[PDB]
Structures are given as structure tokens and as C-alpha cells.
Write an enzyme that holds these catalytic residues in place. Structure first.
Site, PDB file in Angstrom:
ATOM      1  CB  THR A  22       8.309   4.291   6.720  1.00 49.02           C
ATOM      2  OG1 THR A  22       8.554   4.282   5.318  1.00 49.02           O
ATOM      3  CG2 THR A  22       9.370   5.132   7.383  1.00 49.02           C
TER       4      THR A  22
ATOM      5  CG  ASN B 275       1.373   0.295  -2.887  1.00 49.67           C
ATOM      6  OD1 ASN B 275       1.790  -0.165  -1.812  1.00 49.67           O
ATOM      7  ND2 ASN B 275       0.793   1.488  -3.010  1.00 49.67           N
TER       8      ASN B 275
ATOM      9  CB  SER C 194       4.006   0.286   3.346  1.00 48.01           C
ATOM     10  OG  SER C 194       2.916   0.902   2.686  1.00 48.01           O
TER      11      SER C 194
ATOM     12  CE  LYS D  28       4.070  -1.854   0.535  1.00 48.48           C
ATOM     13  NZ  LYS D  28       3.969  -0.532  -0.080  1.00 48.48           N
TER      14      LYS D  28
ATOM     15  CB  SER E 178       6.591   2.258   0.273  1.00 49.93           C
ATOM     16  OG  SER E 178       5.765   1.593   1.221  1.00 49.93           O
TER      17      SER E 178
ATOM     18  CD  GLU F 143      -7.404  -6.334  -0.993  1.00 46.83           C
ATOM     19  OE1 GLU F 143      -6.766  -7.402  -1.262  1.00 46.83           O
ATOM     20  OE2 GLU F 143      -8.664  -6.270  -1.092  1.00 46.83           O
TER      21      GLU F 143
HETATM   22  C1  LIG Z   1       2.089   1.943   3.116  1.00 38.20           C
HETATM   23  O1  LIG Z   1       2.034   2.260   4.326  1.00 38.20           O
HETATM   24  C2  LIG Z   1       1.811   2.986   2.062  1.00 38.20           C
HETATM   25  C3  LIG Z   1       3.045   3.730   1.482  1.00 38.20           C
HETATM   26  N1  LIG Z   1       4.331   3.481   2.191  1.00 38.20           N
HETATM   27  C4  LIG Z   1       4.699   4.525   2.867  1.00 38.20           C
HETATM   28  C5  LIG Z   1       5.765   4.597   3.661  1.00 38.20           C
HETATM   29  O2  LIG Z   1       6.709   3.736   3.645  1.00 38.20           O
HETATM   30  O3  LIG Z   1       5.787   5.614   4.441  1.00 38.20           O
HETATM   31  C6  LIG Z   1       3.669   5.655   2.711  1.00 38.20           C
HETATM   32  S1  LIG Z   1       4.100   7.468   2.689  1.00 38.20           S
HETATM   33  C7  LIG Z   1       5.777   8.009   2.266  1.00 38.20           C
HETATM   34  C8  LIG Z   1       6.235   9.441   2.580  1.00 38.20           C
HETATM   35  N2  LIG Z   1       6.836   9.882   1.284  1.00 38.20           N
HETATM   36  C9  LIG Z   1       6.755   8.788   0.273  1.00 38.20           C
HETATM   37  C10 LIG Z   1       6.590   9.013  -1.239  1.00 38.20           C
HETATM   38  O4  LIG Z   1       7.199   8.253  -1.973  1.00 38.20           O
HETATM   39  N3  LIG Z   1       5.568   9.810  -1.698  1.00 38.20           N
HETATM   40  C11 LIG Z   1       4.848  10.924  -1.126  1.00 38.20           C
HETATM   41  C12 LIG Z   1       3.454  11.044  -1.296  1.00 38.20           C
HETATM   42  C13 LIG Z   1       2.741  12.074  -0.692  1.00 38.20           C
HETATM   43  C14 LIG Z   1       3.403  13.011   0.090  1.00 38.20           C
HETATM   44  C15 LIG Z   1       4.793  12.920   0.264  1.00 38.20           C
HETATM   45  C16 LIG Z   1       5.563  13.925   1.068  1.00 38.20           C
HETATM   46  O5  LIG Z   1       5.071  14.989   1.485  1.00 38.20           O
HETATM   47  O6  LIG Z   1       6.866  13.570   1.207  1.00 38.20           O
HETATM   48  C17 LIG Z   1       5.492  11.860  -0.307  1.00 38.20           C
HETATM   49  C18 LIG Z   1       5.520   8.072   0.781  1.00 38.20           C
HETATM   50  C19 LIG Z   1       2.908   5.262   1.426  1.00 38.20           C
HETATM   51  C20 LIG Z   1       1.533   5.913   1.341  1.00 38.20           C
HETATM   52  C21 LIG Z   1       0.661   2.679   1.062  1.00 38.20           C
HETATM   53  C22 LIG Z   1       1.032   2.608  -0.377  1.00 38.20           C
HETATM   54  O7  LIG Z   1      -0.027   1.486   1.327  1.00 38.20           O
END
Ligand SMILES: *C(=O)[C@@H]([C@@H]1N=C(C(=O)O)[C@@H](S[C@@H]2CN[C@H](C(=O)Nc3cccc(C(=O)O)c3)C2)[C@@H]1C)[C@@H](C)O
Length: 267
Positions: free
Chosen positions: A212, A108, A46, A49, A106, A145
Site C-alpha cells: 500500500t 520507514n 510508501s 517500498k 511500511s 519527505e
Molecule cells: C507511506 O505511504 C506511509 C506509510 N505506509 C502506509 C501504508 O502502507 O499504507 C501508511 S498507513 C497504514 C494503515 N495502517 C498502518 C499502521 O501500521 N499504522 C496506523 C497508523 C495510524 C492509523 C492506523 C489505523 O487506523 O489502522 C494505522 C499504516 C503509512 C503512513 C508513510 C510512512 O510515508
């Protein structure tokens, strides 16, 4: 020898969690740099972004777009992990809000919408990166994807070096005029997914803007940051990692540690 000791420490860190770390860091105060694997390719996840949001602001600058225009999407089936866009489904969002949400959460849904209507899709994002002289970045697939992070697959990869340089041009350089650059920095500064990464590596009176990425595959994760230390020139830090096995989970602490290593290398 500062460089040489930093590299030993990155190297030990990658063998320890059985994986692969890519680092580039810049002190703008000095031109001092440090890279490890800084020209190898690593999945963006991500993290694009961050650039996505800068492309929007570039288009607003150019007056091809209005920051306050309304972006309606009320029928859309929103992609998983759209926590800002879900809440405004019914009413829409200003472009500015949509784009910061992509950045800072982040989102989507925010991402695909922006890339479909305003940016020309993955190829237009790649085009924007080219237009600021980034020849490494390539985005191939859409928000959900592009996290397969298959070892050796070039789709949706950049290099730590490319990423940092680009962040530098965008965050600190002259791609964005003063007013617009300020907003970009504010957006970075308010990112909410980066507490355990580059943020965890710096004194608590440093200011940080970051984006991130977490592929959820091959333990793949990254962060890149503009850092304003107390009374000194900004630093840029770019950290990408992946791991040997599909099923391996990412390591916030590895990213955090590699950041500390990178920052001392250039300090
Ligand atoms: C892209 O890589 C991806 C997104 N973008 C992310 C990122 O910027 O890190 C990741 S994970 C990140 C950690 N916390 C956040 C949140 O909003 N939700 C969440 C979901 C599950 C667990 C936890 C936690 O334990 O803190 C937090 C997300 C994200 C997967 C994808 C969409 O392509």
C-alpha cells in the site's frame, strides 16, 4: 465494451469523491488489460517500498549482499512509523527481515537504512527501476519527505501502468530467479497494511500479495497487487488515487471499489 463500461464506472467514482483515480490491470492468462488514466503521474507514497524490497533481493541474488547479514543501527534516531525496527533497535535485524518489514509494515526506518547503505538512495532506486525497463518511476526524496503529493509535482511519482508492468516483471517475470522470486512473493503475500484495499475486492479464497501507500496529504493513497485466483493465471492490479484538497483524507473504499471494477474489466 467491457473496457468502455469499466471506464464509465471509474470516472463516476472519481467525481463522487472529488478526486482522481488511476488504474491499470493485467490478466496474465490472456494479455487482457484495462487502464484508466493509466499513463498519468500519481505520488508513490510508501508504495515504492515494494520495489525497494525487490532491489534488495536482486542484490542478494547477485551476491552483492547476504540475506542473513546483520544490520545494526543502535544509535539511529528512527523515523516515525518504524514499528519493526524500533523493536530490534538494540540487537539489529537480518537484512531479509529488515527488507520484508519495509515491505509488509511500511517501516520507514527499515526503508531509509536500506536506501542509505545498500541502494544508493533515491537515485539508486530509480536506477533499479530503469534496469528492469521502467522509465516512468522516479524517487526523489527519502522515506518521510516524499509524501507531499502536491498536484502537478513530478517528484516521487510513477504511473499505474508502469507500476503494474514492473510488479509483473518482478513478481511473475524473470528479474528474480526461482528461489528469490518465491521469497519476494511470500513477502508480498504477508503484507499487513492492505486489508481494506485490493484484498477487500476479491473472493476470500484468492491469494494476494500487495504493497500500500498513504501519503497523508491530498487524500493520496494507492495499492498494487499480484492476485492468484482459484485455478487460473495470476492478475496484476495497480490502483493510485489523489484528491483535490490538501486536507482531504484518503479513501480505502474507493481503492477497493476501483479494484473490483478493474478486475471485472479484464475478466
Ligand atoms: C507511506 O505511504 C506511509 C506509510 N505506509 C502506509 C501504508 O502502507 O499504507 C501508511 S498507513 C497504514 C494503515 N495502517 C498502518 C499502521 O501500521 N499504522 C496506523 C497508523 C495510524 C492509523 C492506523 C489505523 O487506523 O489502522 C494505522 C499504516 C503509512 C503512513 C508513510 C510512512 O510515508
Amino acid at each position: 465494451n467491457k473496457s468502455d463500461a469499466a471506464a464509465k464506472q471509474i470516472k463516476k467514482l472519481e467525481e463522487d469523491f472529488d478526486g482522481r483515480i488511476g488504474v491499470f490491470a493485467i490478466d496474465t492468462g490472456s494479455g487482457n488489460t484495462f487502464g484508466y488514466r493509466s499513463d498519468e503521474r500519481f505520488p508513490l507514497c510508501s508504495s515504492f517500498k515494494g520495489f525497494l524490497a525487490a532491489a534488495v533481493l536482486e542484490r542478494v541474488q547477485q551476491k552483492k549482499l547476504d540475506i542473513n547479514q546483520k544490520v545494526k543501527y543502535e544509535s539511529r534516531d528512527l523515523e516515525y512509523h518504524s514499528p519493526i525496527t524500533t523493536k530490534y533497535k538494540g540487537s539489529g535485524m537480518t537484512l531479509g527481515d529488515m527488507a520484508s518489514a519495509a515491505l509488509q509494515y511500511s517501516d520507514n526506518g527499515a526503508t531509509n537504512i536500506i536506501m542509505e547503505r545498500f541502494l544508493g538512495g533515491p537515485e539508486g532506486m530509480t536506477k533499479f527501476m530503469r534496469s528492469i525497463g521502467d522509465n516512468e518511476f522516479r524517487l526523489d526524496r527519502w522515506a518521510l519527505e516524499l509524501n507531499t503529493a502536491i498536484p502537478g509535482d513530478k517528484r516521487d511519482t510513477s504511473t499505474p501502468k508502469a507500476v503494474a508492468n514492473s510488479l509483473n516483471k518482478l513478481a511473475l517475470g524473470n528479474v528474480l530467479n526461482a528461489k528469490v522470486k518465491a521469497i519476494y512473493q511470500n513477502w508480498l503475500k504477508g503484507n499487513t497494511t492492505g486489508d481494506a484495499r485490493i484484498r477487500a475486492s476479491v473472493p476470500a479464497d484468492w491469494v494476494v500479495g500487495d504493497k500500500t501507500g498513504s501519503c497523508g496529504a491530498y487524500g493520496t493513497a494507492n495499492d498494487y497487487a499480484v492476485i492468484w485466483p482459484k485455478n487460473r493465471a495470476p492478475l496484476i492490479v495497480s490502483i493510485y488515487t489523489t484528491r483535490k484538497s490538501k486536507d482531504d483524507k484518503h479513501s480505502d473504499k474507493t481503492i477497493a471499489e476501483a479494484s473490483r471494477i478493474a478486475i471485472q474489466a479484464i475478466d
